[PDB]
């Protein structure tokens, strides 16, 4: 045990180093895609359904990002507590949560709670890759887009019942010592007007902007996954240190 927990603690420290390296490595792409998105938004109409809130919303696609392995001390506990708080907020607002999960621990918790899970992607919380983030973002965005024509309990012409909002519940890695589970709304996004040669767009700014928002959502979900992995590694290091002290 003592040897096992100490070895796990040191391995977790190395994993934190690697996860921080990954988080930093993805920063330039996210920054530059944000710059391009700002440029396109400035020079195009902001009418995308992804960018305008629907009326009388009654559903919300919540993503709960948890860990595959269970040795992390309270990571899953904090994530699920924040998810419950978000569910209470959504119920108060009047929307029925629609649940998407990542990692086996959250699956176990929700199955025990008997709540329904629309889709689960498991097996990569320890080290997510952009393919997983792209798949998750694509599924969530399809669910959200299908939620335009859907009315009340009626799916409308789609036949598929969508969602009127997307939230990501995940653990920010503030520092090597600080981790915190928060729920961040990723869709429908809101436009923020910051005060302060022109870029020649090909073919037109609107098509590029429409094709770029889904990739921006995927990038943000990937950043959330990287933060979740780093936070999980930090929590694992802390739990292993405490256990070795026990």
């Amino acid at each position: 045990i003592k040897k096992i927990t100490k070895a796990q603690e040191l391995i977790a420290t190395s994993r934190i180093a690697k996860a921080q390296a990954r988080v930093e490595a993805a920063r330039p792409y996210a920054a530059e895609i944000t710059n391009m998105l700002t440029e396109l938004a400035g020079a195009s109409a902001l009418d995308h359904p992804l960018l305008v809130e629907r009326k009388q919303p009654k559903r919300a696609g919540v993503l709960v990002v948890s860990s595959d392995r269970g040795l992390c001390g309270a990571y899953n506990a904090n994530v699920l507590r924040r998810a419950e708080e978000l569910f209470s907020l959504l119920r108060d607002e009047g929307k029925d949560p629609v649940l998407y999960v990542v990692g086996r621990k959250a699956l176990g918790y929700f199955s025990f709670r008997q709540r329904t899970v629309v889709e689960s992607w498991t097996g990569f919380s320890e080290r997510p890759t952009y393919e997983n983030a792209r798949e998750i973002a694509d599924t969530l965005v399809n669910a959200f887009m299908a939620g335009a024509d859907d009315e009340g309990d009626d799916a409308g012409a789609d036949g598929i019942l969508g969602v009127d909002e997307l939230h990501i519940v995940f653990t920010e890695f503030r520092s090597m010592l600080s981790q915190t589970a928060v729920a961040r709304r990723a869709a429908p996004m809101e436009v923020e007007y910051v005060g302060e040669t022109l870029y020649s767009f090909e073919p037109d700014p609107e098509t590029l902007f429409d094709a770029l928002l889904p990739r921006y959502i995927a990038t943000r979900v990937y950043a959330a996954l990287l933060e979740a992995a780093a936070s999980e590694s930090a929590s694992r290091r802390r739990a292993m240190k405490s256990a070795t002290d026990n």
């Binding site: 998105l37 700002t38 400035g42 729920a183 709304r185 996004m189 007007y193 005060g195």
Partner: peptide, 14 residues
């Protein structure tokens, strides 16, 4: 309490 994701636009508030 709930972080909202927004796209920054380099324009004056309209």
């Amino acid at each position: 309490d709930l972080e909202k994701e927004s796209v920054k636009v380099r324009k004056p508030a309209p």
